[PDB]
Amino acid sequence: LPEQIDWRKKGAVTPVKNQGKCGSCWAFSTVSTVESINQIRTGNLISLSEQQLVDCNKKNHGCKGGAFVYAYQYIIDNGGIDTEANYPYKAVQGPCRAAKKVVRIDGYKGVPHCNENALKKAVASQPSVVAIDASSKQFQHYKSGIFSGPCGTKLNHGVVIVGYWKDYWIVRNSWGRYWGEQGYIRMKRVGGCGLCGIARLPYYPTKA
Asked: Which residues form the catalytic set?
């Protein structure tokens, strides 16, 4: 496995987005991994719709929260997801609109829990979604450098790992460019269930 990898440098990641005052991180994180796997498999980088999930993914709760599994499942069952351009983000749940099926995935797989070595292996293949505890003030006000806590392991926020280094994970957040390092945060790799519990619940989409 590569000692380091950054999917942003491989053209598989779209510009940082902002979920605003809506609890839709479950959608932004999941959609991000779908945009990435599509580019890795087809060579085409397309920005997809988070708003579609917020409005139509009924198993989840719009701006009130949701789970990775139901998001990926919705995309699969629905036969695909539309683009950001055709179904723009409003930061508020609204009536589910009819949408085009531009990008599709075949399934999704979970990574063994609290095993950063396995997580590293998955990230080396494609960006993966993970849940973390983002309740600490230190995390919410992070600006730069390698974050090393403090933070607990109570899962309450969804983000995406788009790369790594020997000592840290490169994490893509959905709070816009003005948070952290242009929307990203480097989190120290500490083993066990990971910093802020980042290794507790990882998943990635699959596409033949």
From this structure: 25, 157, 173
